[PDB]
């Protein structure tokens, strides 16, 4: 698997997943009313949401972006 992780105006950053981690996920985080941080990366299992976060769980191929 290859999940894109960090998105910048310079472009995207794609690196594969290590042993055990085989999913791509996207997680939101409520930093501030005008900047909701969004993280993305590999995962063995997409973590459950805590602290009123929210997570996108998908399969493969740098999906959802």
């Amino acid at each position: 698997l290859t999940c894109v992780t960090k998105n910048t105006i310079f472009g995207i950053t794609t690196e594969n997943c290590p042993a055990g981690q085989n999913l791509c996920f996207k997680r939101w985080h409520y930093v501030i009313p005008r900047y909701t941080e969004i993280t993305r990366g590999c995962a063995a299992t997409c973590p459950i949401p805590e602290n009123y976060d929210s997570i996108h769980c998908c399969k493969t191929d740098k999906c959802n972006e």
Binding site: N7, T8, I9, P33, Y52
Partner: protein, 273 residues
């Protein structure tokens, strides 16, 4: 934390009520005087209306976003709130650029000023800058937008750093450059060179307003681009909350500044009460 929730609620309710009251007071004071009707006062009314609408729409909703911790309204309502937010946050600095141009022309030509900035020309500039604010607000986030997130509690607009960079530039830094250069000229002229004294007092008052605006809005547009450039330099939620509420409290501050420097504004406020 119930204590944190109630503290945030009461503090932000006081701030928003005071901001609405102060901006309404400014509008009434300028409007109730026939003699005070000048193009610069019309620009001040524009700035006060922009701040008042920003307060009355965004500030309760941003405060609720803070206190609760998610979006409790419709997704289309989230889009409407965000669009109004960016519209007002840009129109405020646009009005500041307009008052900067007005005061530069007033300082340079104290007696030929009415023949350079006329009522029709002033209203033309006002309408043009409002239209430009509408464009630079609505276009960037809806003319180039990613698909909406699956969650109805997410209230972001565009997750691509290109949009945040372009919005930061076109809504703070170009008007900041214009205003900074033009009050550099104004300060140079005032320090080097009846009407002159009056318009110099007006220039000092609006310069204090502009300085407060710049100082209390710079941290926000300095910390968001830092995070956008390299995705590891978000210091903490603390600095983000502080800079955000500093900027919006700055949007609230101006009714304090108006009598602190302008004696005629203080007299108008005294009469209106």
């Amino acid at each position: 934390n119930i204590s944190k929730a109630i503290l945030l609620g009461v503090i932000l309710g006081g701030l928003i009520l005071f901001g609405v009251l102060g901006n309404i007071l400014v509008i009434l004071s300028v409007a109730c005087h026939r003699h005070l009707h000048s193009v610069t006062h019309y620009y001040i009314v524009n700035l006060a209306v922009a701040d008042l609408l920003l307060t009355s729409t965004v500030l309760p909703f941003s405060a609720i976003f803070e206190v609760l911790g998610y979006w409790a309204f419709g997704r289309v309502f989230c889009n409407i709130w965000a669009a109004v937010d960016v519209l007002c946050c840009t129109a405020s600095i646009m009005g500041l650029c307009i008052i900067s141009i007005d005061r530069y022309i007033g300082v340079s030509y104290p007696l030929r000023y009415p023949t350079i900035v006329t009522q029709r020309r002033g209203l033309m500039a006002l309408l043009c800058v409002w239209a430009l604010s509408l464009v630079i607000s609505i276009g960037p986030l809806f003319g180039w937008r990613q698909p909406a997130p699956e969650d109805e509690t997410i209230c972001q607009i565009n997750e691509e750093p290109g949009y945040v960079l372009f919005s930061a530039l076109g809504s703070f830094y170009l008007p900041l450059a214009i205003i900074l250069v033009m009050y550099c000229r104004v300060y140079v002229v005032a320090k080097r060179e009846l009407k002159f004294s009056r318009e110099k007092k007006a220039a000092k008052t609006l310069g204090i307003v502009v300085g407060c605006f710049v100082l209390c809005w710079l941290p926000f547009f300095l910390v968001m681009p830092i995070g956008s450039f390299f995705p590891d330099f978000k210091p903490s939620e603390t600095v983000f909350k502080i800079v955000f509420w500093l900027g919006y409290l700055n949007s609230c501050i101006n009714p304090i500044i108006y009598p602190c420097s302008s004696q005629e504004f203080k007299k108008a406020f005294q009469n209106v009460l």
